[PDB]
DNA sequence: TTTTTTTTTTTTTTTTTTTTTTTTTTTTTTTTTTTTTTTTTTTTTTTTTTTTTTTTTTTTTTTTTTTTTTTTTTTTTTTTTTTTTTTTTTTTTTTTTTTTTTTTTTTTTTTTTTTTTT
C-alpha cells in the first residue's frame, strides 16, 4: 500500500452515502415490526 | 589580501480602500376623545270603545288637449380591436415533526497582577 492511492469521486460518494443511508434506515429511524422499538429505546429500555 | 556586483527588508510616509460611529424619514404605539348598549321611572305618550256632523264619490252630460298619427334624419347603439385590471394554476420557499453531528454563553467567591485616571 502505497502512501497516496487515487480514487475516483463517484465510487467515493457511493460508498460513503450508502453506507450512511443503510445504517440509518436499518438502526436510527425505523422501528422493528415485532417489537415495535427503535435501537434506541430498545436499549434505553 | 583587497576590492567589486547584486539581493532584500527596512528608514519607511502617502494613496486607496475598508471599517465603525452617526442621525432624516415612514411605520408603530399609548393616550384622549367620540360612537354604541343596558337599566329606572317618569310624566308622558299612545292603543282601543262610543257619538257625531262632515265632505268627497258616484246617478248623468259636456268638451279639448293630450292621445291619435306618418315620416326624415339624426345618433345612440352595436361591432371589432386593443389595453388594464382581476383572478386563479404553477412554482418556490420556509417550518415542524424525531434521532443524529457539532458547538456557544452569564454570574458568585478571594487574592494577586496589569492598566488607566487623579
Known sequence: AR???PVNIEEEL?????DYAMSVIVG???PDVRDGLKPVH???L
Open 3 to 5: 502512501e497516496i492511492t
Open 14 to 18: 457511493k460508498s460513503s452515502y450508502l
Open 28 to 30: 436510527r429511524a425505523l
Open 42 to 44: 430498545r436499549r434505553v
